[PDB]
Amino acid sequence: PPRVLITGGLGQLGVGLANLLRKRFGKDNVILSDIRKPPAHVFHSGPFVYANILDYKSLREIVVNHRISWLFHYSALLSAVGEANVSLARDVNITGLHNVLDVAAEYNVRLFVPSTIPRTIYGVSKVHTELMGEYYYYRYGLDFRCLRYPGIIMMYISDCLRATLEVMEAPAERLSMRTYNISAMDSNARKDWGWKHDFDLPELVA
Amino acid sequence: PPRVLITGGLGQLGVGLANLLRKRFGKDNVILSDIRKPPAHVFHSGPFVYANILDYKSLREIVVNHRISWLFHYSALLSAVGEANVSLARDVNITGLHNVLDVAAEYNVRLFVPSTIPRTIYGVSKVHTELMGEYYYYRYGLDFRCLRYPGIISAPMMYISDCLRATLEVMEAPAERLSMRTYNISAMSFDSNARKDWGWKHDFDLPELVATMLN
Ligand SMILES: NC(=O)c1ccc[n+]([C@@H]2O[C@H](COP(=O)([O-])OP(=O)(O)OC[C@H]3O[C@@H](n4cnc5c(N)ncnc54)[C@H](O)[C@@H]3O)[C@@H](O)[C@H]2O)c1
Ligand SMILES: NC(=O)c1ccc[n+]([C@@H]2O[C@H](COP(=O)([O-])OP(=O)(O)OC[C@H]3O[C@@H](n4cnc5c(N)ncnc54)[C@H](O)[C@@H]3O)[C@@H](O)[C@H]2O)c1
């Protein structure tokens, strides 16, 4: 059973991703994390921890002390949210990745990081997430795993969270590449690991 | 007449470019800079300064105190050494770059950064060099101008004299004549947009390459 740390956990996806993995590997094996304050219920779901991504030593303390093997990395400044504060966006996305790759490469941690489908600091850092992530796989052993999320509710949320769960369960031997395109409504994604979008146009209305 | 700051100048290109521009714009108009001790002659060639690219504050000072209008960013860890020192290479190529962009965009500087023709953190940062600089051209008015250097012959290739001249030319150009910020630049093999837009013509094809090299 793996030990999870979800970075940027209080976002749209992170909370759901958490409660999926919790009912899988157990309550105490998924550690949720953010810089913002957790609502009443999401706190009590399971171990929540303040974790600043720009603070490199925070991550290490946590990954050592809490014996982390799997790390999901959702913390990022959104496109428009970061276009007003570029320095911040650039730091949080690119420096944050750098700190995340180092912690994971050093302490032998499976690293999930989502990408997307550049005129925008968010987009530039997603290209950079892919290329850097692929480099740390070659240069060190880093078990880096990434899949380009499209639009999420294009695709439904329950497909998006389960796509993330499956690609981490799978063996590294059956992954021809480290960055995957995941599409609902992507052959390699469907071939290497059994990917199938459940929610398509009609049953998405239900 | 612009005032030039070269960055990482004590490399291969840096001294050549420095010596080229000092003949063009004047000696004390071109400040050369690096974090190494410059040889006796290059130090006296004209204004030399310690410029660490990992100190943002240091750059601002330099840029303001000398009214730097043009900046040539040559400070880098080329993959060879950077592949061992990933941490140090990452910082210098990426965070270093960031600092250059910011200083440039702030004090309204014309910024030259060279790229190359990705499984090495050097290469990954050169992709980054390009996608940022162009973003910074749209997000702010940053006059960012990038050539993609090929194999650079000295003593898909190119003799050093072309490399340097091409860089002077792409910076002298009217912003009006540039359809794009990153331009391919080619000589020989053994760059349509560059020739099309700002009149790039390489004077050192092969015959004269061999001619010069033998001296
Ligand atoms: N929302 C979508 O539909 C969508 C679409 C495409 C891609 N994605 C990708 O999915 C990922 C997660 O999506 P989401 O909706 O959960 O994110 P979100 O935008 O809802 O939340 C982002 C989180 O990042 C955190 N954060 C910001 N700076 C931080 C720092 N320095 N340290 C730690 N945390 C910090 C915030 O507190 C926040 O909880 C994103 O990285 C994004 O690239 C999402
Ligand atoms: N000549 C080529 O083969 C070639 C090919 C393609 C691209 N390029 C590009 O041209 C540029 C210059 O090439 P070069 O031949 O001078 O390389 P070089 O290795 O000779 O010079 C790099 C310089 O960067 C300096 N430097 C290192 N860390 C620094 C820091 N923190 N602050 C300031 N300076 C620092 C070093 O002192 C060194 O003098 C590079 O950016 C490279 O991307 C060169």
UniProtKB/Swiss-Prot annotation, chain B:
The UniProt record lists the keyword Ubl conjugation: no
Catalysed reactions, semicolon-separated: L-threonine + NAD(+) = (2S)-2-amino-3-oxobutanoate + NADH + H(+)
GO BP annotations listed: L-threonine catabolic process to glycine; threonine catabolic process
GO cellular component, one term: mitochondrion
Keyword Cytoplasm: no
Protein name: L-threonine 3-dehydrogenase, mitochondrial
Keywords of the record: Mitochondrion, NAD, Oxidoreductase, Transit peptide
Main location: mitochondrion
Gene Ontology molecular function terms on file: identical protein binding; L-threonine 3-dehydrogenase activity
EC number assigned by the record: 1.1.1.103
Function: Catalyzes the NAD(+)-dependent oxidation of L-threonine to 2-amino-3-ketobutyrate, mediating L-threonine catabolism.
Compartment list: Mitochondrion
Active site per database record: 122 (proton donor/acceptor)
Pathway membership, UniProt: Amino-acid degradation; L-threonine degradation via oxydo-reductase pathway; glycine from L-threonine: step 1/2
Binding site residues for NAD(+): 8-13, 34-36, 52-53, 122, 126, 152
Superkingdom field: Eukaryota
Known partners and oligomeric status: Homodimer.
Family, similarity comment: Belongs to the NAD(P)-dependent epimerase/dehydratase family.
